[PDB]
Curated annotation (Swiss-Prot):
Remaining remarks: Although the ATP-dependent helicase activity displayed by the INO80 complex requires INO80 ATPase activity, it is likely that the helicase function is carried out by the other components of the complex, RUVBL1 and RUVBL2, and not by INO80 itself.
Family membership noted in the UniProt record: Belongs to the SNF2/RAD54 helicase family.
Protein name: Chromatin-remodeling ATPase INO80
Protein's gene: INO80
Lineage of the species this protein comes from: Eukaryota, Metazoa, Chordata, Craniata, Vertebrata
Function of the molecule: ATPase component of the chromatin remodeling INO80 complex which is involved in transcriptional regulation, DNA replication and DNA repair. Binds DNA. As part of the INO80 complex, remodels chromatin by shifting nucleosomes. Regulates transcription upon recruitment by YY1 to YY1-activated genes, where it acts as an essential coactivator. Involved in UV-damage excision DNA repair. The contribution to DNA double-strand break repair appears to be largely indirect through transcriptional regulation. Involved in DNA replication.
Tissue: According to PubMed:10574462, widely expressed. According to PubMed:16298340, specifically expressed in brain, liver and pancreas.
Length: 41
DNA sequence: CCGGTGCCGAGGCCGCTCAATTGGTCGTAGACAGCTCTAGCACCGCTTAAACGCACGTACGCGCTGTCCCCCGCGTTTTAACCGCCAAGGGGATTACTCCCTAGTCTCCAGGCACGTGTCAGATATATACATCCTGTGCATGTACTCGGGATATTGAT
């Protein structure tokens, strides 16, 4: 829905293997427009 | 006054929902099998020569074998400082994160010393005659163990 509704907003998903998620967290640690994460995460 | 009963609060059950673990498959590349001489070379076959290893007596000590006496071990007692357990304060080693940096890869370069061969000569095995230094034996004596009695600590209980 974000990748199609508007070609402006940038998503930075946060759900997956500890490695990928840690890398994503390190990234912004600014294009972090929107973030997608689960309740448990 | 006490007691039945609704309301609320808590404990018990069950179940996913999700995040972390571990054996299975793909794949490619440097290194275990495996000739191929070769190569000269150790290993084998075939001889003798000398000596050490082996066996038989036989002399001759150093281990087993029998008898008295106390000194050390056994066994008891009480009691006390130590072992073991418990508990609390707090410091520091642990765990996780970001940032820096030098290990690791490989590439290129090149001159120093491992490494082999060739030459030759003097240090070392070896045999024989010479001889004297070390070794078994015998024996005097004195440094050291032992017994006894008087100093100086050296601990424990008021």
């Amino acid at each position: 829905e974000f990748t199609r509704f508007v070609p402006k907003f940038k998503v930075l998903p946060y759900w997956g293997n500890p490695h990928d998620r840690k890398v994503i967290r390190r990234f912004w640690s600014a294009p972090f427009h929107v973030v997608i994460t689960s309740y448990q995460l």
